[PDB]
């Protein structure tokens, strides 16, 4: 049973309506199922432990028995009259609301009390590493004590109550074994209150540490089910939400990104220059679109973000072409009639809006750093919005210069300030971008081995690629973490892949002389580096031309392997290299024993 206890308000006959939460002057009795007593007992148990320090310091008020907050009522206990009717409990143990209040504020008040002392006990305890993980190692008690008698700073609490803290301590550190009163010798065994827990944390030499290897697994299992690593290369529309894209604002360096390497950025590849004009704040400036191609951020295929083009440390040659100086650098949109990459001359450019200029010309924004005047780090920045560009077939964001007077000097300059580190930040997660289009769902499998070397590094913050990369990256840490894809152990991961290579290379051999019986020693090893190359750089699985990894099978395969692989690790997964791991722990205890030996001499 569970929930609050109910009782037949109509008396005797208890039906699915003659019940009612048995409330009263104390609040409502909620049932205390077996396991929920484990907690409140485990919590109180950790407080009772500090008994010797509560009396010493006259705080506290006696040991807290959980049997002081409960009661022994009886009735039907469920979550609702209907279902509570199927849990007739007699003399169960319930805790009334007003009690659920004290057991709370008591464990809270006492928790402070101890939390404090417990902190002093520690700066003194750990102040001599009472924990080794291979074999033993003593340190003659006299010295030890006479030593901490020093180190411990005058405001601890282990100097005001030595054997009032010691008695608390003995129950937390199975290192300190108190000398028995009637034989005046230790005990071999150490009996700290955490008897079992402390036994099951020792780094057992057979397998690393059960508490470790156990969690590193349940931890990975969490992720595997959580983010949705499963279904990682699913071939079908998936809401961007399914990718929980967060804290995702990637930055670049355009005016370098080739147009074909990333759809969201077209260029004005035209013969001559395209000097246009525009009255901005009265003054008339001339946008240039200089000698080179001047790659500009396209506006369509640009998920309403927060574009913030930073222009700093980048050269600013106002020294040579004086034409450049005087011009306030500024991010400006450019609506063109004919599609760009077909826009020849000025009459082609519909209009030009200065979405964000920089007050003060190019001769205050400068700063000489050895001849080559740089740009005082400043951030121009628009706030592009999907629909502010409705209809408008062609429009481009360009972080240019806005020259107040074009001249012969700036005839080979080309004032694109795009060489600066632009940082787009998708401000509306629901919508992603792929191959130049804005969508609401991705098709994972499509984005695999479909980008090129740099059609990946040039991805646009929160676009399929960047999403089908953030995803693999989780799955990449589950294998990297739990599975042993980094040793000659032909693990579950590199194993799922090997079975694909076989089934694959086996049918490609079917029909024709079949002169080559499948290899296997070579297949195991080829798939080992395939699974390994993945854990290594999760990204690669997106680039066209990557051995194994990019065939449709793998990944879809890998994950579902790694999947079941985590759901069976056992507990002693740590047996892997638990030999050198062990031998390394003995190595430490031998060096730490060496320490105790000095504590033992210096302070005799």
């Amino acid at each position: 049973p569970t929930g609050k206890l109910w009782r037949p308000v109509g008396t005797s006959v208890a039906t699915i309506d003659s019940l009612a939460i048995v409330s009263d002057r104390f609040g409502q009795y909620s049932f205390v199922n077996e396991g929920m007593r484990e907690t409140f007992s485990k919590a109180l148990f950790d407080i009772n432990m500090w008994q010797p320090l509560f009396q010493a310091t006259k705080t506290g008020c006696g040991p807290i028995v959980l049997s002081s907050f409960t009661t022994t009522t009886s009735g039907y206990v469920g979550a609702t009259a209907g279902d509570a009717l199927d849990n007739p409990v007699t003399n169960g143990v319930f805790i009334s609301t007003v009690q659920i209040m004290n057991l709370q504020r008591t464990i809270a008040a006492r928790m402070r009390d101890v939390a404090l002392w417990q902190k002093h006990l520690d700066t003194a305890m750990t102040m001599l590493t009472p924990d080794i993980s291979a074999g033993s190692a003593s340190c003659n008690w006299k010295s030890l004590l006479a030593f901490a008698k020093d180190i411990l700073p005058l405001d601890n609490l282990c100097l005001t109550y030595p054997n009032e803290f010691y008695n608390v301590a003995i129950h937390r550190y199975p290192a300190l074994k108190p000398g028995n009163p009637d034989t005046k010798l230790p005990d071999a065994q150490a009996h700290p209150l955490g008897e079992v827990a402390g036994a099951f944390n020792a780094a057992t030499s057979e397998v690393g540490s059960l508490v470790g290897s156990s969690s590193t697994l349940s931890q990975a299992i969490s992720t595997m089910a959580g983010k949705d690593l499963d279904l990682i290369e699913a071939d079908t529309p998936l809401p961007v939400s399914v990718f929980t894209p967060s804290l995702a604002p990637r930055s670049y360096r355009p005016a370098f990104i080739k147009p074909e390497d990333a759809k969201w950025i077209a260029e004005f590849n035209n013969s001559s220059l395209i000097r246009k004009t525009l009255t901005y704040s009265g003054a008339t400036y001339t946008v240039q679109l200089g000698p080179g191609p001047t790659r500009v951020i396209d506006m369509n295929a640009m998920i309403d973000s927060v574009l913030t083009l930073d222009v700093s440390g980048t050269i600013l040659p106002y020294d040579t072409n004086p034409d450049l100086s005087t011009s306030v650098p500024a991010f400006v949109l450019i609506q063109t009639s004919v599609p760009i990459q077909q826009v020849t001359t000025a009459a082609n450019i519909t209009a030009i809006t200065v979405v964000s200029a920089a007050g003060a010309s190019a001769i205050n924004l400068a700063i000489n750093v050895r001849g080559q005047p740089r740009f005082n780090m400043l951030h121009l920045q628009a706030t592009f919005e999907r629909e502010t560009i409705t209809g408008i077939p062609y429009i481009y964001g360009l972080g240019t210069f806005l020259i107040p007077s074009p001249t012969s000097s700036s005839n080979f300059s080309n004032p694109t300030l795009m060489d600066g580190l632009l940082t787009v930040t998708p401000v509306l997660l629901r919508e992603t971008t792929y191959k130049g289009e804005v969508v609401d769902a991705i098709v994972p499998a499509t984005v695999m081995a479909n980008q090129t070397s740099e059609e990946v590094a040039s991805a646009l913050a929160n676009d399929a690629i960047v999403l089908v990369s953030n995803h693999l990256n989780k799955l990449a840490n589950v294998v990297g973490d739990a599975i042993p894809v980094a040793s000659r152990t032909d693990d579950s991961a590199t194993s799922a892949i090997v079975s694909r290579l076989a089934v694959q290379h086996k049918l490609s051999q079917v029909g024709q002389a079949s002169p080559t019986p499948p290899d296997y020693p070579l297949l195991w090893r080829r798939a080992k580096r395939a699974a390994s190359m993945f854990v290594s750089n999760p990204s690669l699985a997106l680039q066209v031309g990557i051995p194994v990894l990019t065939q449709s099978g793998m990944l879809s395969a890998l994950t579902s392997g790694v999947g079941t692989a985590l759901r069976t690790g056992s507990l002693g997964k740590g047996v892997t290299d638990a030999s050198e791991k062990l031998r390394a722990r003995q190595s430490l205890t031998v060096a730490k024993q060496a320490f105790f030996d000095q504590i033992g001499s210096l302070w005799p």
Partner: protein, 41 residues
């Protein structure tokens, strides 16, 4: 370390005590007590 006597079953400077870690019993108390909504009830 001044002698106490009864407050607690052990004296610190008491006769034959012994600091001596054993890889076997990693000291512990109770930190990870579960209280999260679903798990506490």
């Amino acid at each position: 370390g001044n002698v106490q006597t009864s407050v607690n079953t052990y004296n610190i400077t008491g006769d034959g005590n012994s600091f001596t870690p054993t890889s076997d019993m990693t000291s512990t108390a109770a930190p990870a007590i579960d209280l999260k909504p679903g798990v506490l009830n």
